[PDB]
Amino acid sequence: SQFIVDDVSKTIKEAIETTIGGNAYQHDKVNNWTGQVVENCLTVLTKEQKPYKYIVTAMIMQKNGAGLHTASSCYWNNDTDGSCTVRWENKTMYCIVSVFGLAV
Amino acid sequence: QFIVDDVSKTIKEAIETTIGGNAYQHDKVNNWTGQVVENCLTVLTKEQKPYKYIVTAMIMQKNGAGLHTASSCYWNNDTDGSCTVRWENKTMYCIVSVFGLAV
Amino acid sequence: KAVIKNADMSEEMQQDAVDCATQALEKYNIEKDIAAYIKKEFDKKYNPTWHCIVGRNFGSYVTHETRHFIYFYLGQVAILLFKSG
Amino acid sequence: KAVIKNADMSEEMQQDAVDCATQALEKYNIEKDIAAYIKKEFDKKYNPTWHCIVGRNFGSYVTHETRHFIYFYLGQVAILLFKSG
């Protein structure tokens, strides 16, 4: 149908909460967390059988007083494509996630 | 139609042109990530292909902090591709990614 | 039962510290051992790095992670538990 | 009389520790302040983050960075001074 920012934002927050919700930075589980986050969102997004290609990226930075800066733009169909970037943080982690939906 | 060696070269150049030879400076980094994104995006769009591009750039101040990124897609494996580049100097880490999708 | 003298920790975590200390006393007699039971217990459930000092006579000056510090009295000993690292 | 019970630090740094402790003991009577004096010298001359426990009766179980630990007695008083950023 079409890229619905509100839904996508829900899927992200959800995924984030599951994977890292209530944990502390640990290089141990980090690789697997960030991985599960993208995989979950992707699992959900695709399941809706919509006519879209999706791109999901996630990054977790160990909160530690370090400066972090990101930027993103696209060259696509500003009429049928969309994106949502969610910021999430807790005691020890800075987490950013993005999902880009590009029409068929 | 998406050549990874091509884009990788563009990315690296864009990184060098923008932050190559400078040190982390809070109120200058925001300008830098944006340039790297515009730089890469400008070069990629000239060759007006029936492709869509997504470009993300991030710069973290080296401070012994941990950083992990992950990404994946649901696209056409036969046409769409991507290139992620790790980069770093004395004061900062940089990660740039480009994704290409046809149609 | 316990008396929280000074603290910077959530309520549930505080309760947890008391609970853990309560049991540590039921299983050990020497101060150094009570500490270990506590220190190890916290490291597991709330993540490294914790430090515990148990005694009847001592002063202290330590630096700690926010929301992770507590000094209380229980039984015949004082208990200092804090995260740093 | 200084007695290094358990130590893990530069021979020079150990001496440095004992010295500072002695001075502390003859400037303050309250253990709490004794600790403070010591901990502050090491955060200054050897970078943060140091922790000190000064008492006559206590047990502990702490974690520390290599080469940055020492548990020496100075008279009847026991001094625990370790680093754990």
Partner: peptide, 29 residues
């Protein structure tokens, strides 16, 4: 199809000196 540039998005977490606390405790007597 009509392709074009999207808006630009930026995230900026400024560098901050972590805030730590130093406590002092003392046994009575």
């Amino acid at each position: 199809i009509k392709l074009g540039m999207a808006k630009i998005t930026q995230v900026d977490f400024p560098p901050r000196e972590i805030v730590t606390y130093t406590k002092e405790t003392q046994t009575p007597v």
